[PDB]
């Protein structure tokens, strides 16, 4: 339950949000990899 | 908030590029649960030290001489990861400091006056402390402040980080002293460029600096480096023309908040993937837009600084004393006519009573400084806050590894000339009772075993070194069922058989009743099956020799000692049945106060030795209140050690081998920290 | 009345580096 609440807190914390029209390719990879892992924490959290 | 970042200090933006590349490349091969790097840009090294102190950043890399400026309060910074300089096969930790000069320039070391000099920093190890410390005492008065007299000594120079406002001669060859890579002559390569451009007559660097900046063998055949013996030698051989050896650069961190396990967790996964051509894309130890950024370009690996080792034990004692005398400005003359009073060391508030009574009954020649374990008082000798100790041979091996020497060695045999006679030693035995006749040295599985304390000769090293070759594994808490051995880990059964209450269980000192020889005999009488003591324990506690009642009631004949083959031989006949012959105890001290502790204890012996009768109502240094405190109670005289003053020579070959078969099983942290030094 | 437990699968173990957690629900990893 702690990992679920931390995941929701970080994602909604990113929904303020910083708005670039353009980013670097490795920055974009860091983004999709990043909040993709937050989906992995949340969807892994619900059934547990 | 990512909640697990290691902040890092960069000295310029020109290093902050390297921090950003190390951050993005180190983001990949660590998973998302692991730690990550963040970058903090501070202007100078000292502002980063204040930054880590005020909890902004967490780590930086500093030299050996700047850790001394990093642990002084209110900073309190400790080295946590040290780096290595040799090859991967034989890792070196020390490195050399040398003085490189132009060819045919016509200086030896003693004409070195008024010539423009290229330093690498103010307080860095290989560039300031060894050059100024070598040529230091030829300077005229006033020595303090050091920079005024060095500033009048060299006819202009460049030493970065020195205050150019109060001292213009230090910042003369450089335009302004800047503490970053923006100053074009900072660092090892910068001081060598201060030699190469022709403005400097001498440049003080390490040995690999001339190798790294040049790629031509003939150009290295031009430049030379000058020695201690007033000779010039070529730069290919720095083993013979080096000024001094210094410890490595370290990543400093905080002492309380840390966090050290994330620094080691980060860099340990960093040097594997990124160390030496391990990735072609990113380099940890090389950079395109500069050299020596965040690390050295001569480093090859990182090993952990042990947790016992603090700052002063990292730098050593010789180097801490040289930097401290170079700051305060003393330059001692030292002819040995009168000696200072010896600061003795004593543990745990009974030895403070007997020590202080001895401090008053002397003239004033023996003082007392306390400790709570013996392992801590050995470190307190190594720092300098105490001088002597009386240790048994197992801790004489530890303090021998750490750099102390034995001076006087306790005798036990009464004679009309015992200051001369070298005794062979005393025999270790194990003592069992007449109630149990099924016990046998071959049959020790699941029996309770009382011990003197961890690390001692007759209680731990000699018996468990013999039990180790049978049981073939390091854990002894699983072989015996229970047993009383103090000083071991609080989790073990070996801890929870002992009696010292409360919270003083397994504390290796006289807080417990069960500590010592006689306390091992107490747990043998009360709750144990076998105890490991000296051979003289049962006669000293047999038959009303102890007025304390549990030993007042006891007798000799019921307790009989056991051989190692499995038979019974009487306590009266100890020579034909013993575990091993362990050496007698010894007084240890540092190598400089050897003659003084020798002299003061020889004179101080004859007043308060065994010749003095009427002990109650007077002072008897060798007797005590049966707890065997500050000295072994059946000493006769402190024997002289001549021709044999080294732990190797004094302890003998069989005992050094007998401890060496147990050295992989040892868990004492101070031995690990002392053996960290060796490459 | 119920005196026994039927489902036991709440046991889980993590790696020594604690990087990954295994579970006994499918798909047995978060990844
Ligand atoms: C013991 O003390 C007496 C009196 O102080 C002294 O004369 C004697 O020399 C001492 N014994 C030794 C062995 O020095
Ligand atoms: Fe250095
Ligand atoms: Fe002993």
UniProtKB/Swiss-Prot annotation, chain B:
Pinpoint the Transferrin-like domain residues.
6-328, 342-664
**Tissues in which the UniProt entry reports expression:** Expressed by the liver and secreted in plasma.
Q: Which residues are glycosylated?
A: 32, 413, 472, 611
| Effect of substituting residue 300 to R | In allele TF*CHI
Which Gene3D superfamilies does the protein's record reference? Periplasmic binding protein-like II
Asked if the keyword Ligase belongs to this entry, the reply reads: no
Question: Main localisation, per the record?
Answer: secreted
Alphabetically sorted, this entry's keywords are: Disease variant, Disulfide bond, Glycoprotein, Ion transport, Iron, Iron transport, Metal-binding, Methylation, Phosphoprotein, Repeat, Secreted, Signal, Transport
Q: Which SMART domains match?
A: TR_FER
Phosphoserine modifications at: 370, 666
User: Which Gene Ontology terms of cellular component type are present?
Assistant: apical plasma membrane; basal part of cell; basal plasma membrane; blood microparticle; cell surface; clathrin-coated endocytic vesicle membrane; clathrin-coated pit; cytoplasmic vesicle
| A single BP term in Gene Ontology | osteoclast differentiation
Which superkingdom, per the lineage?
A: Eukaryota
Q: Which residues bind Fe(3+) 2?
A: 392, 426, 517, 585
InterPro entries per the record?
Answer: Serotransferrin_mammal, Transferrin, Transferrin-like_dom, Transferrin_Fe_BS
Disulphide-bonded residues: 9-48, 19-39, 118-194, 137-331, 158-174, 161-179, 171-177, 227-241, 339-596, 345-377, 355-368, 402-674, 418-637, 450-523, 474-665, 484-498, 495-506, 563-577, 615-620
Q: Does the keyword Ribosomal protein apply?
A: no
Consequence the record notes for mutating residue 258 to S: In allele TF*C3; associated with a reduction in total iron binding capacity; risk factor for iron deficiency anemia in menstruating white women
Positions carrying Dimethylated arginine: 23
Residue numbers binding hydrogencarbonate 1 = 120, 124, 126-127
Q: Which disease is it linked to?
A: Atransferrinemia: A rare autosomal recessive disorder characterized by abnormal synthesis of transferrin leading to iron overload and microcytic hypochromic anemia.
Q: What is known of its domains?
A: Has a bilobed structure, each lobe binds a single Fe(3+) ion. Does not always bind 2 Fe(3+) ions.
Per the record, the similarity remark reads: Belongs to the transferrin family.
Q: How does it assemble?
A: Monomer. Part of a complex composed of SLC40A1/ferroportin, TF/transferrin and HEPH/hephaestin that transfers iron from cells to transferrin.
Q: What is this protein called?
A: Serotransferrin
């Amino acid at each position: 339950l702690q990992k679920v609440k931390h995941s929701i807190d970080q994602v909604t914390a990113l929904s303020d949000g910083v708005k670039p029209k353009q980013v670097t390719k490795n920055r974009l990879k860091e983004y999709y990899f990043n909040i993709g892992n937050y989906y992995s924490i949340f969807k892994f959290g619900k059934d547990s | 908030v990512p909640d697990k970042t290691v902040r890092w200090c960069a000295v310029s933006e020109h290093e902050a590029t390297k921090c950003q590349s190390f951050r993005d490349h180190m983001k990949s091969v660590i998973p998302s649960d692991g730690p990550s790097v963040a970058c903090v840009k501070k202007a100078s090294y000292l502002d980063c030290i204040r930054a880590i102190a005020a909890n902004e950043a967490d780590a930086v890399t500093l030299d050996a001489g700047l850790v001394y400026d990093a642990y002084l309060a209110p900073n309190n910074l400790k080295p946590v990861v040290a780096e290595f300089y040799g090859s991967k096969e034989d890792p070196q930790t020390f490195y050399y400091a040398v003085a490189v000069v132009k060819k045919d320039s016509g200086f030896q070391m003693n004409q070195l006056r008024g010539k423009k000099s290229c330093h690498t920093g103010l307080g860095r190890s290989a560039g300031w402390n060894i050059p100024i410390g070598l040529l230091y005492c030829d300077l005229p008065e006033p020595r303090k402040p050091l920079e005024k007299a060095v500033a009048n000594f060299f006819s202009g120079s460049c030493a970065p980080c020195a205050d150019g406002t109060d001292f213009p001669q230090l910042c003369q060859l450089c335009p302004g002293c800047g503490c970053s890579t923006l100053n074009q002559y900072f660092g090892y390569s910068g001081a060598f460029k201060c030699l190469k451009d022709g403005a400097g007559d001498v440049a003080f660097v390490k040995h690999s600096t001339i190798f790294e900046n040049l790629a031509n063998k003939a150009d290295r055949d031009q430049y030379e480096l000058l020695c201690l013996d007033n000779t010039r030698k070529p730069v290919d051989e720095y083993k013979d023309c080096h000024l001094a050896q210094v410890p490595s650069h370290t990543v400093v961190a905080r002492s309380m908040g840390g966090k050290e396990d994330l620094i080691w967790e980060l860099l340990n996964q960093a040097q594997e993937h990124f160390g030496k051509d391990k990735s072609k894309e990113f380099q940890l130890f090389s950079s395109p837009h500069g050299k020596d950024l965040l690390f050295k370009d001569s480093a090859h690996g990182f090993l952990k600084v042990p947790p016992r080792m603090d700052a002063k034990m990292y730098l050593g004692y010789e180097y801490v004393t040289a930097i401290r005398n170079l700051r305060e400005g003393t330059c001692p003359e030292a002819p040995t006519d009168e000696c200072k009073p010896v600061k003795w060391c004593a543990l745990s508030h009974h030895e403070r009573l007997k020590c202080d009574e001895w401090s008053v009954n002397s003239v004033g020649k023996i003082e007392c400084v306390s400790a709570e374990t013996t392992e801590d008082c050995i470190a307190k000798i190594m720092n300098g806050e105490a001088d002597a100790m009386s240790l048994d041979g197992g801790f004489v091996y530890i303090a021998g590894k750490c750099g102390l020497v034995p001076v006087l060695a306790e005798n036990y045999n009464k004679s009309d000339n015992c200051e001369d006679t070298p005794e062979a030693g005393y025999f270790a035995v194990a003592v069992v009772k007449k109630s149990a006749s099924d016990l046998t040295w071959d049959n020790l599985k699941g029996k309770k075993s009382c011990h003197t304390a961890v690390g001692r000769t007759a209680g731990w090293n000699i018996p468990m070194g013999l039990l180790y070759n049978k049981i073939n594994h390091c854990r002894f808490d699983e072989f015996f069922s229970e047993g009383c051995a103090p000083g071991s880990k609080k989790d073990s059964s070996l801890c929870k058989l002992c009696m010292g209450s409360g919270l003083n269980l397994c504390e290796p000192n006289n807080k417990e009743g069960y500590y010592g020889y006689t306390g091992a005999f107490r747990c043998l009488v009360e709750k144990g099956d076998v105890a490991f003591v000296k051979h003289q324990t049962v006669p000293q506690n047999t038959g009303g020799k102890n007025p304390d009642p549990w030993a007042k009631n006891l007798n000799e004949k019921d307790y009989e000692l056991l051989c190692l083959d499995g038979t019974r031989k009487p306590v009266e006949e100890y020579a034909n049945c013993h575990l091993a012959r362990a050496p007698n105890h010894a007084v240890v001290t540092r190598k400089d106060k050897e003659a003084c502790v020798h002299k003061i204890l020889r004179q101080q012996q004859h007043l308060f030795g065994s010749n003095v009768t009427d002990c109650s109502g007077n002072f008897c240094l060798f007797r005590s209140e049966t707890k065997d405190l500050l000295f072994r109670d059946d000493t006769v005289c402190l024997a002289k050690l001549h021709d044999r003053n080294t732990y190797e020579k004094y302890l003998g070959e069989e005992y050094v081998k007998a401890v060496g078969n147990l050295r992989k099983c040892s868990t004492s942290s101070l031995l690990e920290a002392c053996t960290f030094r060796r490459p | 009345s119920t005196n026994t437990t039927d489902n036991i699968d709440y046991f889980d173990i993590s790696d020594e580096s604690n990087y990954y957690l295994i579970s006994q629900l499918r798909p047995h990893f978060s990844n």
